[PDB]
Design an enzyme around this catalytic site. Structure first.
Site, PDB file in Angstrom:
ATOM      1  N   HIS A  54      61.389  26.241  63.997  1.00  0.00           N
ATOM      2  CA  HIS A  54      60.298  27.182  63.753  1.00  0.00           C
ATOM      3  C   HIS A  54      60.758  28.596  64.059  1.00  0.00           C
ATOM      4  CE1 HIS A  54      58.227  23.321  64.862  1.00  0.00           C
ATOM      5  NE2 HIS A  54      57.680  23.570  63.690  1.00  0.00           N
ATOM      6  N   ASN A  58      58.911  19.270  56.210  1.00  0.00           N
ATOM      7  CA  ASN A  58      58.540  18.090  56.993  1.00  0.00           C
ATOM      8  C   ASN A  58      59.019  16.799  56.369  1.00  0.00           C
ATOM      9  OD1 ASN A  58      57.304  19.197  59.352  1.00  0.00           O
ATOM     10  ND2 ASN A  58      55.586  19.851  58.046  1.00  0.00           N
ATOM     11  N   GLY A 117      52.272  20.623  60.056  1.00  0.00           N
ATOM     12  CA  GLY A 117      52.254  19.180  59.883  1.00  0.00           C
ATOM     13  C   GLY A 117      52.212  18.755  58.427  1.00  0.00           C
ATOM     14  N   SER A 125      53.992  24.823  59.010  1.00  0.00           N
ATOM     15  CA  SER A 125      54.203  25.618  60.227  1.00  0.00           C
ATOM     16  C   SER A 125      54.938  26.956  60.018  1.00  0.00           C
ATOM     17  CB  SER A 125      55.012  24.791  61.230  1.00  0.00           C
ATOM     18  OG  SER A 125      56.327  24.582  60.728  1.00  0.00           O
ATOM     19  N   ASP A 153      63.406  25.169  69.530  1.00  0.00           N
ATOM     20  CA  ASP A 153      63.457  23.858  68.863  1.00  0.00           C
ATOM     21  C   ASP A 153      64.292  23.929  67.581  1.00  0.00           C
ATOM     22  OD1 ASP A 153      61.896  24.889  66.807  1.00  0.00           O
ATOM     23  OD2 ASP A 153      60.023  24.006  67.495  1.00  0.00           O
TER      24      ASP A 153
END
Length: 180
Positions: free
Chosen positions: A159, A75, A46, A9, A156
């Site tokens: 990002h 991740n 992802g 991402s 969040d």
């Protein structure tokens, strides 16, 4: 003369105009400073160290890159996966890229402060370990001046927002430049 970016991402520019994303800015800086590189962004939201490892051989075969920038494992940490499997997967990716003829640059990421130093470091130290083991280049703190900062992160807190994209590029260029 291809520069392959294999990220998640962060390098896929999640939540913003990809043309304003850091990789896009990389290509424009290469053009401006008279470097002759094709930038191929292969970043997917992802993705994990295992996922990047699984999909790299096809990318190496197709693009035959001279440079591979790896930005994975964010991740793996955010999910609480095992730090050891991260080290294995990234190491193997760097091995396979080097085996194709490419120089490898690892982008390391530090999770947000609320994870606490021990957790943060458990993953963070892996990047340096892989770079050591596979003789790669390394930007240990890819999110320097972005992570945890207001304005630089989207809500969040993972990002990066649009305003951070220049800084992301700033953080890579110095370590990348000598490889070009």
């Amino acid at each position: 003369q291809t520069l392959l970016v294999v990220g998640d991402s962060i390098s896929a520019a999640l939540g913003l105009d990809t043309s304003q994303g850091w990789v896009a800015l990389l290509q424009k800086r290469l053009a401006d400073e008279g470097y002759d590189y094709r930038v191929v962004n292969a970043s997917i939201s992802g993705d994990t160290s295992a996922g990047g490892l699984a999909r790299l051989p096809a990318l190496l075969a197709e693009e035959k890159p001279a440079l591979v920038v790896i930005e994975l494992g964010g991740n793996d940490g955010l999910r609480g996966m095992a730090p050891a499997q991260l080290q294995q997967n990234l190491a193997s990716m760097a091995q396979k890229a080097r085996a194709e003829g490419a120089k490898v640059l690892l982008l390391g990421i530090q999770l947000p402060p609320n994870y606490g130093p021990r957790y943060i470091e458990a993953f963070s130290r892996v990047y340096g370990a892989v770079a050591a083991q596979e003789k790669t280049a390394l930007v240990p703190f890819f999110l320097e001046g972005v992570g945890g900062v207001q304005g630089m992160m989207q809500a969040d807190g993972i990002h990066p927002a649009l305003a951070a994209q220049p800084r992301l590029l700033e953080n890579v260029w110095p370590t990348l430049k000598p490889l070009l």
